Ligand binder design. Sequence first.
Ligand SMILES: C[N+](C)(C)C[C@H](O)CC(=O)O
Length: 599
Amino acid sequence: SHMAHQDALPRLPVPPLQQSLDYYLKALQPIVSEEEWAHTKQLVDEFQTSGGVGERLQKGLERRAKKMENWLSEWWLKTAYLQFRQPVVIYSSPGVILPKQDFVDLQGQLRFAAKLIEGVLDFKSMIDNETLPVEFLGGQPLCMNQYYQILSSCRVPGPKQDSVVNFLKSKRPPTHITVVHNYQFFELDVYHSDGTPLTSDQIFVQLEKIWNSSLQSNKEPVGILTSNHRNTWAKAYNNLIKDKVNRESVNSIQKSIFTVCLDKQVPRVSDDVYRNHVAGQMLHGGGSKFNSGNRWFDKTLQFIVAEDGSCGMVYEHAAAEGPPIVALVDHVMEYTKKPELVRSPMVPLPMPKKLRFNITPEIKNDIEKAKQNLSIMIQDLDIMMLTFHHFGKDFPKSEKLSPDAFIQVALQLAYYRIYGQACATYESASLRMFHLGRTDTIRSASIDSLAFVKGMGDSTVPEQQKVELLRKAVQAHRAYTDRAIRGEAFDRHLLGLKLQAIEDLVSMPDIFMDTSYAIAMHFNLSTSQVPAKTDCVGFFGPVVPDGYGICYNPMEAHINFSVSAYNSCAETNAARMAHYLEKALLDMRTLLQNHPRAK
Ligand SMILES: C[N+](C)(C)C[C@H](O)CC(=O)O
């Protein structure tokens, strides 16, 4: 947004070596053995010894920060996503489920879909004009650069590493979106000649023509190719755009402000697994026979409107971060409720261009391969959506406790109860207080948390002592959260030293080849909060085979949880973890309330 605003932002810092290495050792203690900790302790010293390797790398990062807006920007985007060759589906692109809608027929589906498009465009006008209210936290400005990445962009396959294209602010910014129905894509202009955007009514009419221009699911699901392994997809992608029409269709999708998916009717399932499936539809689409082919997963923003009223979205992480999405969601959902205006007399409206795809025996073979790959993926994903009705932010806040810290500590209590030990845990922290900041790591497994979980279950340790261990565990977490937000966390900084070493062509340092670093970066628990005003929830796959993906939205009197795991690992089960997590949240409340402070 405002130039003055972004110009006042502090630039991402490089924390002091001794600081980050100290925090590093503290965070390792709860997850490694003493031998492993002792050895890592020795390696940590050698790394920071006078005139040693650590210093040369450290100064490298400091120089790097003087010559760049953000010393970590390109590096994070590159190593976390563009270089991640796993399919973006389930493994990277977050899935979001919005509050169900009440439409009961097709027309209601097109109507809502239309309202939503107008909603996003209203949100877009604010971003174009730079009128979107500048944001703050505690009184510190927050970078607004993430709002410019989510629209009119698209991930691009690469034989070695992908890339991201953005056209929001080009000479001829896009004015069309892409709509896909029954696997067929269309190019729909959402603005008139005079810049004014179409209306909810003008949109609905266009979507109707599209619906008609694809009555049957009688075409190849080209789009499903975007969900295969990035290396496989890069080859199939290249072979796909060897054709002029294909290339032109693809090109149209890449520049489209965003994509809207009008899903087809799917079989009915028992109620107790209904939410689970809906999430599946938003996360991955359900598979080859359902709506997976009704997607273009490279697209930064994909809004999904189900046939049964459900709806949600899925964004590609390369160019999308949490904050923008949350803001867009809240603003759009609210807009779809704001009463319209008298129908703007209808003016002549063109036919939405259909983006055809010439199929060849090779393009068709890749598609069959993509169906098969995705199918395996879905069959391995274990999801359990938990709606914690017991309480939300109200309880923790009435106890003068941060709800996020509380939930995180509950999760630690739940994991320990199941496995009898703690594990490397990750919780997304927003680095937005700094120019171009995306995220840093908050480590939920701490000295205090383990102390709390052990004691919590120790028959000898008194309830009163348990409650004190709990309060310490929560506060420790909150502090870490605040620290990570101010750039005092250490994970990104450690990554930087390593990358700096590689860049300078220096032998990989011992500190990184260390078993302890392998364990510290192997996140059996991957988490993130979605602090939305809308009663929605996010979800994503575990970052490790034997791990869980947990995402939550704390509401006032309840909490929306998503828990994911992989079937290929017998030691992890979604339901069980969700079941324990609930019990952990409740035992924590019971414990807190039975041992108050004073009167
Ligand atoms: C899901 N997870 C934590 C892997 C990615 C986060 O949503 C974004 C981040 O932490 O950079």
